[model samples]
Target: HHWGYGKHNGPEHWHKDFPIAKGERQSPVDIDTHTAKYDPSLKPLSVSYDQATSLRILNNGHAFNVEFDDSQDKAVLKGGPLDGTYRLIQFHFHWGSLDGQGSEHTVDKKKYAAELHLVHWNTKYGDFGKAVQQPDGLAVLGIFLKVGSAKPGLQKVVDVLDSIKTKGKSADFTNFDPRGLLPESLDYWTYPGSLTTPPLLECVTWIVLKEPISVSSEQVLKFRKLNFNGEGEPEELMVDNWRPAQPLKNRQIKASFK
Candidate 1:
């Protein structure tokens, strides 16, 4: 496949004919740049956003990932709101530059300035891909981005992120109600995870939310001006994506109030 185009050359080389397509969990990785000889017990959960829950926004540019739709209200929790009827599937963002850092949850090992995954799916463990495979069946809501002030709940979704910056473009971003971009302090930090990408399947439960939201350097330059190459392509920009840290092997990186 010497750049000859792939998959015996035909149907657009089908991802260059599947070049090592991996993902037992697959994510932004770098959860403290490796080296975890077990570090557990750090609890302090309690989260909410149930004004009869009903919100859906999707300008889908480079940031913004909210999807909670268990037909509506069901985000009930006295500690870590993901304790039932979870269905807000898909919210995303990880950034860098403008003083570059680009979060992926790794404080003591460094890496932050941006990171905002908010996927949830405990539909009674039967769907969201068989509940992402178990360990309490999926629920991630890690948010930790900081630049400085202006976070009126992410300036109302970065005032609509330049209206979707290309690449398979998207729209239909509605009334925006991701609990007003959470951080009035429902304090959280629980853990039991996987799916930071790569069959990293311990089965996920990570809650992470000690409030680190600021996002405004023009919303971190519209997420470092996102570019998996699309819009026009002059080496478009935005590179590598991420996903490096894994193998907590013996597992147990809990923290709900450590």
Candidate 2:
């Protein structure tokens, strides 16, 4: 119950509890895009979200997740490297304490200010928790965030951070369509990996978009205000909430574009 970005309970020690830390397939790899092969058969990804599906934003001690209504087929992801429909459930962000080095996955070993994970589950699994047991059960949509211009889309989330500053704190967040979060181009890198968190399930097909959306430097600072400690305790920033890049091993990393 004590997993965090802190020195002792961090990534380096995660292997003790979750043996999969040494497993062949782990999340957050350094993408040397130059050597990543392009597959001609790869199809463009299709994402459609219901504006009404957004439920609430909660600070879950580690990071804040924007929960969505997934009971019905209101929001869905298809095509690209996936053949079945995956339902969007919740999404969260990973960031560093400082700029230029927070993202879990790095391109050409270059880091970004932050990273976003839109978690989805294969419909065949019928449940979000159940999908974690299958290898091809989750399709995660990733977007890198650069610090610079103001992006209203990202600002929407930042604007609500004040209300959920403490761990376990949550606020109703609605009328938010995920389209505001996606970048222009759907070009991406695809690979097999595990969740970058505890339990470290190797069930995700990482679909990381090549292009990053912009966020003001001030906007990113808002993320740090979130507390790791719950109500009545001292405040601890949710900074550096990320897993270090794991080995590429022998898994094939593919690109949708040349």
Candidate 3:
């Protein structure tokens, strides 16, 4: 069986196969800003994206993923809590069934409407597959989403969801920069954690931004229109695909801003 959001194969049951699910440094931890150490030495985040690097967008059973061509250094992230250059591999989202509990990571024990994850691989590791096995091989930028005005650029992404409504479905997507998805402030909290999914490898250096971007209630509700099941199977709405927040044992959560 594969990992999923269902009660049978959900995050609680992941440890049955992927033992790392119970390991230290697990992701989606609660960010208690009051307790997070503010490091003045932390550098400002540097993000460089080239729309030409965009490859395609797809529904991968679990969630809708926007993939990027990492073969070249066209799109990359560096500085701010990162050790080296990390190439953009893909980006995805985790949302809730309603407007309330969708985000993976919480701030001061408060969850958001949704969360966005921009997955990147460290150049020092050569490739993503290999990097997934190393402790410092991945750098993921987490951005929280709130309900309000609809983000125009985000509409471009939402508009294509109909084309890839079922799992294994995909479409050509290019000339779109993921940078538009980010909030104005780059201030963030950094911590070491694992992938919040099956084979939960402990390789992510999570940089979660404090500011959240806006999305309309209608915009996020559209994501529920997607199905986790493929064309031949019974339809399963893709909602609440996020994993629960894990323990923050033996690690310091650092902040880049006040």
lDDT leader? 3
lDDT per residue for candidate 1 within 79-126, as digits (tens), equals 343456566655676666544576766655566677777776677875
Give the Cα-based TM-score of candidate 2 against the true structure: 0.98
RMSD of 2: 1.0
Error of 1 at 205 (Å): 1.3
Error of model 2, residue 37, in angstroms: 0.6
lDDT of 2 by residue, 54-92 (tens): 999999999999999999888888888997899999999
User: Model 3, range 1-258, lDDT digits (tens) per residue?
Assistant: 588999998988899988888898898899988899999888888988853378899999999999999998888999988888999999999999988889999999999999999999999989999999899999999999999999887998999999999999999988788978999998899999989887789999999999999999889989989999999899899999999889999988999976
State the weakest 10-residue window (summed lDDT) of model 2.
43-52
Error of 3 at 108 (Å): 0.7
After superposition, candidate 1 runs with Cα above 4 Å error: 1-63, 68-88, 94-99, 102-104, 125-138, 141-160, 163-190, 193-204, 207-220, 224-251, 254-258
- Cα RMSD of all models vs. native, in order, equals 17.8, 1.0, 1.0
Q: What is the lDDT of candidate 2?
A: 0.91
Candidate 1 residue-pair clash tally: 21
